[PDB]
Structures are given as C-alpha cells and as structure tokens.
Symmetry: none
Subunit: 93 residues, 5 copies
C-alpha cells in the first residue's frame, strides 16, 4: 500500500512550481532515468561531443580554436522563483 | 494499491506549474527515460556532435574556428516563476 | 489498483500549466521516452550533427568557421510563468 | 484497475494549459516516444544534419562558414504563461 | 505500508518550488537515475567530450586553443528564490 499526498488542500492564491515523481519496480548509453524537469540553460555551449568511432585515426592535422569574445547582456529578474503579492521589475536607462 | 493525490482541493486563484510522473514496472543510445519537461534553453549551441563512424579517418587536415562575438541582449522578467496578485514589468529608455 | 488525482476540485480563477504522465509495464537511437513537453528553445543552434558513416574518410581538407556576431534583442516578460490577478508589461522608449 | 482524474471539478474562470499522457504495456532511429507537446522554438537553427552515408568520402575540399550577424528583435510578453484577471501588454515608442 | 504527505494543508498565498521523488524496488553509461530537476546552467561550456574510440590514434598533430575573452554581463535578481509579499527589481542607468 503506497499513498502520496501533495498540496491536498490549498486556500488562497499561492505561486507554485511542482514536480512529483513516483516509481515502483555503445559509446554513450542512458537508461531508466529522468532528466531536465525544471532545467534552465543559458549561454550553454558544447563544441565537440561523441564525434564517433575511429575519428582522426591516422595522420590527422587539426587546429581547434574557440572564441567567446562578445558583448552579451543577460538580465533576469526572476528565474525559477515564483512570487506572490509582490513586485518585480527590470529597468534600464 | 497505489494512490497519488496532488492539489486535490484548491480555493482561490493561484499560479501554478505542475509536473507529475508515475511509473510501475549504437554510437549513442537512450531508453526508458523522460527528459525536457519544463526545460528552457537560451543561446544554447552545439557545434559538432555524433559526426559518425570513421570520420576524418585518414590524412585529414581540419581547421575549426568558433566565434560568439556579438552584441546580444536577453531580458526576461519572469522565467519558470509563476506569480499571483503581483506586478512584473520590463522597461527600457 | 492505481489511482491518480490532480486538481480534482478547483474553486476560483487560477492560472495553471499542467503535465501528467502515467505508465504501467544504428548511429543514434532513442526508445520508450518522453521529451520536450513544456520545452522552450531560443537562439538554439546545432551546426553539425549525425553527418553519417565514413564522412571525410580520406584526404579531407576542411575549414569550419562559425560567427554569431549580430545585434539581437530577445525580451520576454513571462516565460513558463502563468500569473493571476496580476500585471505584466514590456515597455520601450 | 487504473483510474486517472484531472481537473474533475472546476468552478470559476481559470486559464490553463494541460497535458496528460497515459500508457499501459539505420543512421538515426526513434521508437515508442512522445515529443514536442508544448514545445516552443525561436531562432532555432540546424545547419548540417544526417547528411548521409559516405559523404565527402575521398579528397573532399570543404569551406563551411556560418554568420548570424543580423539586427533581430524578438519580444514576447507571455510565453507558455496563461493568466487570469490580469493585464499584459507590449509597448514601443 | 508507505504514506507520504507534503503541504497537505495550506492557508494563504505562499511562493513555493517543490520536488518530490518516491521509489520502491560502453564508453559512458548511466542507469536508474534522476538528474537536473531544478538545475540551472549559465555560461556552462564543454569543449570536448566523448570524442569516440581510437581518436587521433596515430601520428596526430593537434593544436587546441580556447578563449573566453569577452564582455559579458549576467544580472539575476532572483534565482531559485521564490518570494512573497516582497519587492524585487533590477535597475541600470
């Protein structure tokens, strides 16, 4: 006998993010998993990954260069931060 | 006997994001999984990935260059942040 | 016996995003999965991927260049952030 | 015996996005999956993908250049953010 | 007999992020796991990863350079920090 109760009774006006998981029971492998439920990614970069089998196996001449030299402005008042009866703002002048 | 109850009773005007998962029971592989439910991606970049088998196997001359040198402005008042009886705003001048 | 109850009773005017999943039981492979339910992607880029088998196998001369050097403005007051009895706005001058 | 109940009773004028999934039980492969339910994509780009078998196999001379250098303005007051008895707006001057 | 109760009764207008997990019971491998529930990633970069089997096996000449030399401003008033009856703001002049 398994019983799960979440927020069974609520009165008012909340601000909520919820996540509920229940469970009874090659080069890159992944199995029987949960990922990236409330995930957030910003300026996330992956240059090389899982190129493959026998790459650049013989007499390979390679030049790898990576430049992230840029003017970038990321502004976020609230991130994964629910709020209630409050005040949020972003202002620039 | 499995019972799950979420937000069974609510009174008012909330602001909610919900996620409920229940469960009874090659080069790149993935199996029996959940991903990217409430995921968010911004400026997310993947240059090379899973090119394949035997790439650049023999006498490969390669020049890899990556430049992210740009003026970019990402402004987000609320991200995955539900709200109630509140005030949000983005202002520029 | 499996029972799932979500938001069984509601009174008022909420603002909700819901996701409910229930379950009883080659180069790139994917099987028996859920993905991208409430996903969001902005400025998401993938230059090379899964090119194929034996690419650039022999005497390959390659020049790879990537430039993201641009004026871009992404403005988002609310993202995956439902709200109630509130006020949101985007203003520019 | 499997029973699922969602929003069984509602009184008022909410604002809702819902997703319910129930389930009893080559180069690129995908099987038995759900994807892109409430997905959103903006400025999403994929230059090369799944070119094929034996591409550029022999003596291939290649020049790859990618430029995203443009004036672009993406403005979104509400994204996957339902709301109720509220006020949203986008203003420019 | 297993019973779990969370936020069974609530009165008011809170601001909440919730995560509940319950459970009864190749080069890179992952199995039977949960990851990235409320994860956040900013300026997260992975240059090389899981290149593959026998890469640069013989007489490989390689030049790897990585430059993160850029003007970048990341401003975040609230991150995974829900709030209530409060005031948050981002201001620039």
């Amino acid at each position: 006998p398994l019983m799960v109760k979440v927020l069974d009774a609520v009165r008012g006006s909340p601000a909520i993010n919820v996540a509920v998981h229940v469970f009874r029971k090659g080069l890159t492998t992944e199995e029987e998993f949960v990922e990236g439920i409330y995930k957030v990614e910003i300026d996330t970069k992956s240059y090389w990954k899982a190129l493959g089998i026998s790459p650049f196996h013989e007499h390979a001449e390679v030049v790898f260069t990576a430049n992230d030299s840029g003017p970038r402005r990321y502004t976020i008042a609230a991130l994964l931060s629910p709020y209630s009866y409050s005040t949020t703002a972003v202002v620039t002048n």
